[PDB]
Design an enzyme around this catalytic site. Structure first.
Site, PDB file in Angstrom:
ATOM      1  N   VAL A   1       0.796  -1.355   0.027  1.00 30.04           N
ATOM      2  CA  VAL A   1       0.117  -0.108  -0.060  1.00 30.04           C
ATOM      3  C   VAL A   1       0.824   1.125  -0.036  1.00 30.04           C
ATOM      4  O   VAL A   1       0.840   2.099  -0.748  1.00 30.04           O
ATOM      5  CB  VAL A   1      -0.907   0.109   1.284  1.00 30.04           C
ATOM      6  CG1 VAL A   1      -1.847   1.295   1.276  1.00 30.04           C
ATOM      7  CG2 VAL A   1      -1.825  -1.269   1.197  1.00 30.04           C
ATOM      8  N   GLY A   2       1.814   0.974   0.665  1.00 31.48           N
ATOM      9  CA  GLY A   2       2.905   2.287   1.027  1.00 31.48           C
ATOM     10  C   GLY A   2       3.724   2.073   2.047  1.00 31.48           C
ATOM     11  O   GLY A   2       3.573   1.212   3.098  1.00 31.48           O
TER      12      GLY A   2
ATOM     13  N   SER B   1       5.337   0.878   6.739  1.00 27.00           N
ATOM     14  CA  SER B   1       5.109   0.197   5.496  1.00 27.00           C
ATOM     15  C   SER B   1       3.932  -0.729   5.809  1.00 27.00           C
ATOM     16  O   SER B   1       3.969  -1.616   6.496  1.00 27.00           O
ATOM     17  CB  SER B   1       6.422  -0.533   4.998  1.00 27.00           C
ATOM     18  OG  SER B   1       6.066  -2.083   4.776  1.00 27.00           O
ATOM     19  N   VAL B   2       2.753  -0.522   4.872  1.00 26.88           N
ATOM     20  CA  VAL B   2       1.574  -1.276   5.025  1.00 26.88           C
ATOM     21  C   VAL B   2       1.135  -2.162   3.858  1.00 26.88           C
ATOM     22  O   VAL B   2       1.396  -1.562   2.790  1.00 26.88           O
ATOM     23  CB  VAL B   2       0.533  -0.596   5.898  1.00 26.88           C
ATOM     24  CG1 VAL B   2       0.957   0.567   6.277  1.00 26.88           C
ATOM     25  CG2 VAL B   2      -0.518  -0.301   4.887  1.00 26.88           C
TER      26      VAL B   2
ATOM     27  N   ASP C   1      -3.820   7.255  12.405  1.00 26.80           N
ATOM     28  CA  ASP C   1      -2.589   8.002  12.364  1.00 26.80           C
ATOM     29  C   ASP C   1      -1.330   7.239  11.654  1.00 26.80           C
ATOM     30  O   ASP C   1      -1.478   6.060  11.468  1.00 26.80           O
ATOM     31  CB  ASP C   1      -2.220   8.190  13.891  1.00 26.80           C
ATOM     32  CG  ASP C   1      -1.168   9.405  14.027  1.00 26.80           C
ATOM     33  OD1 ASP C   1      -0.807  10.001  13.118  1.00 26.80           O
ATOM     34  OD2 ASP C   1      -0.619   9.556  15.398  1.00 26.80           O
TER      35      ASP C   1
HETATM   36  C1  LIG Z   1      -8.042   4.374   1.607  1.00 26.39           C
HETATM   37  C2  LIG Z   1      -6.827   3.277   1.904  1.00 26.39           C
HETATM   38  N1  LIG Z   1      -6.164   3.316   3.092  1.00 26.39           N
HETATM   39  C3  LIG Z   1      -6.378   2.333   4.126  1.00 26.39           C
HETATM   40  O1  LIG Z   1      -7.478   1.719   4.297  1.00 26.39           O
HETATM   41  C4  LIG Z   1      -5.583   2.170   5.191  1.00 26.39           C
HETATM   42  C5  LIG Z   1      -4.415   3.172   4.970  1.00 26.39           C
HETATM   43  N2  LIG Z   1      -3.250   3.036   5.922  1.00 26.39           N
HETATM   44  N3  LIG Z   1      -2.045   3.634   6.172  1.00 26.39           N
HETATM   45  C6  LIG Z   1      -1.630   3.724   7.471  1.00 26.39           C
HETATM   46  N4  LIG Z   1      -2.243   2.872   8.254  1.00 26.39           N
HETATM   47  C7  LIG Z   1      -3.513   2.145   8.236  1.00 26.39           C
HETATM   48  N5  LIG Z   1      -3.957   1.338   9.076  1.00 26.39           N
HETATM   49  C8  LIG Z   1      -3.319   1.281  10.274  1.00 26.39           C
HETATM   50  C9  LIG Z   1      -3.089   2.119  11.159  1.00 26.39           C
HETATM   51  C10 LIG Z   1      -2.416   1.970  12.518  1.00 26.39           C
HETATM   52  N6  LIG Z   1      -2.441   2.825  13.726  1.00 26.39           N
HETATM   53  C11 LIG Z   1      -2.963   3.913  13.890  1.00 26.39           C
HETATM   54  O2  LIG Z   1      -4.005   4.554  12.996  1.00 26.39           O
HETATM   55  C12 LIG Z   1      -2.547   4.570  14.964  1.00 26.39           C
HETATM   56  C13 LIG Z   1      -1.584   4.608  15.767  1.00 26.39           C
HETATM   57  C14 LIG Z   1      -1.251   5.548  16.829  1.00 26.39           C
HETATM   58  N7  LIG Z   1      -2.446   6.290  17.242  1.00 26.39           N
HETATM   59  C15 LIG Z   1      -3.617   6.308  16.642  1.00 26.39           C
HETATM   60  N8  LIG Z   1      -4.625   7.300  17.070  1.00 26.39           N
HETATM   61  C16 LIG Z   1      -5.920   7.411  16.170  1.00 26.39           C
HETATM   62  C17 LIG Z   1      -6.869   7.826  16.831  1.00 26.39           C
HETATM   63  O3  LIG Z   1      -6.775   9.088  17.231  1.00 26.39           O
HETATM   64  C18 LIG Z   1      -5.562   9.274  18.215  1.00 26.39           C
HETATM   65  C19 LIG Z   1      -4.169   8.814  17.829  1.00 26.39           C
HETATM   66  C20 LIG Z   1      -3.653   5.470  15.422  1.00 26.39           C
HETATM   67  C21 LIG Z   1      -2.010   0.553  12.777  1.00 26.39           C
HETATM   68  C22 LIG Z   1      -2.207  -0.384  11.997  1.00 26.39           C
HETATM   69  C23 LIG Z   1      -2.919  -0.251  10.630  1.00 26.39           C
HETATM   70  C24 LIG Z   1      -3.026  -1.310   9.786  1.00 26.39           C
HETATM   71  C25 LIG Z   1      -4.127   2.305   7.244  1.00 26.39           C
HETATM   72  C26 LIG Z   1      -5.545   2.047   6.660  1.00 26.39           C
HETATM   73  C27 LIG Z   1      -6.603   1.334   7.433  1.00 26.39           C
HETATM   74  C28 LIG Z   1      -6.548   2.481   1.046  1.00 26.39           C
HETATM   75  C29 LIG Z   1      -7.844   1.492   0.872  1.00 26.39           C
HETATM   76  C30 LIG Z   1      -7.406  -0.042  -0.230  1.00 26.39           C
HETATM   77  C31 LIG Z   1      -6.267   0.094  -0.683  1.00 26.39           C
HETATM   78  C32 LIG Z   1      -5.193   0.785  -0.297  1.00 26.39           C
HETATM   79  C33 LIG Z   1      -5.256   2.070   0.531  1.00 26.39           C
END
Ligand SMILES: C=C(NC(=O)c1cn2ncnc(Nc3cc(NC(=O)c4ccnc(N5CCOCC5)c4)ccc3C)c2c1C)c1ccccc1
Length: 337
Positions: A26-27, A33-34, A164
């Site tokens: 994805v990136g 890196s995800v 995030d």
């Molecule tokens: C629209 C497209 N993109 C996604 O669907 C998509 C893209 N990303 N990139 C980064 N991480 C992602 N997700 C994620 C995020 C955390 N971590 C966090 O979000 C965290 C880490 C630390 N603190 C917070 N919070 C959030 C709430 O507010 C306070 C701090 C929150 C861990 C593991 C994971 C897999 C993610 C998703 C779900 C997409 C869809 C289909 C194909 C390609 C792209």
């Protein structure tokens, strides 16, 4: 345990459980890196983040602990949820990698806006959902601090979640005025400024404040919100800071109704309450939820607060192995949703 399977993507190896198939990158970059994959146990698509060198340094070890603990605590509809956390290690001694899994989303808030001009009702629903998740998070003394379109996910039906380190399939643009000019002693309202910035850019198709640096950014802001008044001046600790601001050509606050013309006068009124230089006067997430602007979505009964979150660890200075072990316990104690 379950069953793993190696494989390399981009140039990074992926040791994941068989339940995840179709790993498509994805990136990368950052500390992560995800990949996008298919969750066979659920029939749903998920996002899997393999952290980079999780325990290489003390900052890495503690930032790995921080995120895991955070994601573990977050149980709310407008906040990214942790579906699963795993490692291909069978013991703490071999513990070197950490993978975090969440629902895959439809698109970054940046794509939506970048595409077309959303309706007012769209702005109300999107900004309403951000504030709903914000009330939850702020209620636990958690401050996002990096709100921006890319950290906002919405699915096919405009349902939103805050995340995030969003990896797109300048953060300074949404940065509060205070957390740039330093001032230190930043607080949660720093997030409301970001929301005000995000909302303005949803109503208008452009970045409210496209500053090229900390100096320009502050310039762009003040032309709008004006230059600090005697009341705000009285609360500025830094000698260099007030020497700085007080030295600029003084600017008046602008009439937002003039600045955001054609926009719902209720949206402008919300904008006005969010885009305040003085952090103490900004509206709070919770009080913003009761704003006339969200009459159609607002429900004081379905606007939950978080269980109390203990971030005592934030104050601790430990060894990579102590943070790694702490993190191992957190992985081991993980109970799915
Ligand atoms: C629209 C497209 N993109 C996604 O669907 C998509 C893209 N990303 N990139 C980064 N991480 C992602 N997700 C994620 C995020 C955390 N971590 C966090 O979000 C965290 C880490 C630390 N603190 C917070 N919070 C959030 C709430 O507010 C306070 C701090 C929150 C861990 C593991 C994971 C897999 C993610 C998703 C779900 C997409 C869809 C289909 C194909 C390609 C792209």
């Amino acid at each position: 345990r379950p069953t793993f399977y190696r494989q390399e993507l981009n140039k990074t190896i992926w040791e994941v459980p068989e339940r995840y198939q179709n790993l498509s990158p994805v990136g990368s970059g950052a500390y992560g890196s995800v990949c996008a994959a298919f969750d066979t146990k659920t029939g749903l698509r998920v996002a899997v983040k393999k952290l980079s060198r999780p325990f290489q340094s003390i900052i890495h070890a503690k930032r790995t602990y921080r995120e895991l603990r955070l994601l573990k605590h977050m149980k709310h509809e407008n906040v990214i949820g942790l579906l699963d956390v795993f490692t291909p290690a069978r013991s703490l001694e071999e513990f070197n990698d950490v993978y975090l899994v969440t629902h895959l989303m439809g698109a970054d808030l940046n794509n939506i806006v970048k595409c077309q001009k959303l309706t007012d009702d769209h702005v109300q629903f999107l900004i309403y959902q951000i504030l709903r998740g914000l009330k939850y998070i702020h209620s636990a003394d958690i401050i996002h601090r990096d709100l921006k379109p890319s950290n906002l996910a919405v699915n096919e039906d405009c349902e939103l979640k805050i995340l995030d380190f969003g990896l797109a399939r300048a953060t300074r643009w949404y940065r509060a005025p205070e957390i740039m000019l330093n001032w230190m002693h930043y607080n949660q309202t720093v997030d409301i400024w970001s929301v005000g910035c995000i909302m303005a850019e949803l109503l208008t198709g452009r970045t409210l404040f496209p500053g090229t640096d900390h100096i320009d950014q502050l310039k762009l802001i003040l032309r709008l919100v004006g230059t600090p008044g005697a009341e705000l001046l009285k609360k500025i600790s830094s000698e260099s800071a007030r020497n700085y601001i007080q030295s600029l050509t003084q600017m008046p606050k602008m009439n937002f109704a003039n600045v955001f013309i054609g926009a719902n006068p209720l949206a402008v009124d919300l904008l006005e309450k969010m885009l305040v230089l003085d952090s103490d006067k900004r509206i709070t997430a919770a009080q913003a939820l009761a704003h006339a602007y969200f009459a159609q979505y607002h429900d004081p009964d379905d606007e939950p607060v978080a269980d109390p979150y203990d971030q005592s660890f934030e104050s601790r200075d430990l060894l990579i192995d102590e943070w790694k072990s702490l993190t191992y316990d957190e992985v081991i104690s993980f109970v799915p949703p």
